[PDB]
């Protein structure tokens, strides 16, 4: 499950820091987070899909 576009995994000698400072390390892009609600649904009363929103 990579971006290789074919069957194969190989061996992964990557993401190695060679310096005593950790900010010298390669871009930290192992983790992806998708929490859209803080921007798309910030209202107090959560509205169900089915129900007409204002009553």
């Amino acid at each position: 499950t990579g971006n290789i576009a074919t069957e194969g995994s190989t061996i992964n000698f990557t993401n190695i820091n060679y310096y005593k400072d950790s900010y010298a390390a390669s871009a930290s892009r192992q983790d992806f987070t998708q929490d859209p609600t803080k921007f798309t649904s910030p209202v107090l009363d959560a509205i169900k899909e089915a129900a007409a929103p204002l009553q």
């Binding site: 992964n12 000698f13 900010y23 390390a25 390669s26 892009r29 192992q30 007409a52 204002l54």
Partner: protein
Amino acid sequence: NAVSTLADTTISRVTAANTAASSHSLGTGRVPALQAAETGASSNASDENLIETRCVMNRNGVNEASVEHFYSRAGLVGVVEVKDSGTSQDGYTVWPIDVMGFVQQRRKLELSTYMRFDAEFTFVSNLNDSTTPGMLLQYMYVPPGAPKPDGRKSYQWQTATNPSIFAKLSDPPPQVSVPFMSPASAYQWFYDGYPTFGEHKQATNLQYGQCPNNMMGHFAIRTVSESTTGKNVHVRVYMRIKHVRAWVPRPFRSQAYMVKNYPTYSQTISNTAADRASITTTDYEGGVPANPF
């Protein structure tokens, strides 16, 4: 051990949200289509409730729309000209470190209000004829309040504590990692206020919007020489943000920028959307209708 750790380092595929099969819904009471934009929330309605959908097990990858991926790409942030010919025979230049100089990088970074990142800086240096001779150059980072050099050979280039980089134009471009350097907990492209107390009654309100939490000193660049080389050197500085966290998204700038550190726009307002003849005009020929029904 740490071997298992290396195995799980390739970026894994996170897929997009799947569609579920849906049928007709002929009942009163259930109204997914009806929303209330007034509440301030985006529509919660899904494809499956508005039309009859099939089951799709979506395998499209979302890993690339990340603030890491979006910003982890080196872009031009400065061009320092080390003039050593004609009227300008200084053979050194002190360039204020700011990333708001060039549109392509500025506009990307101003998507956020606050950002905390480490950056990687690359110095592509060459002559007017794009030639890279064996010419030695000193790149010295001068943190805010470190003395700035006033001459080609001044004491400030001893660098007992200032970090400097010696490289020949001949060598592949110098690169260094820089940490998150800021008194504040994050950087801040928009500061709505003044850095000093006062009444701010100046015919030119320069001080407005200028937070020194962002101003991160200068880079002093010289040709390590005794006398005028008679050659100007161009230093393209490339910044690749990394380890990036961003807060409070903002609208992408529409108007062309005018100055470096101030959002200011020409009184000619360029419309966000390219205009067309009428509100019922679309530019698509399509095909020949079978029943003209």
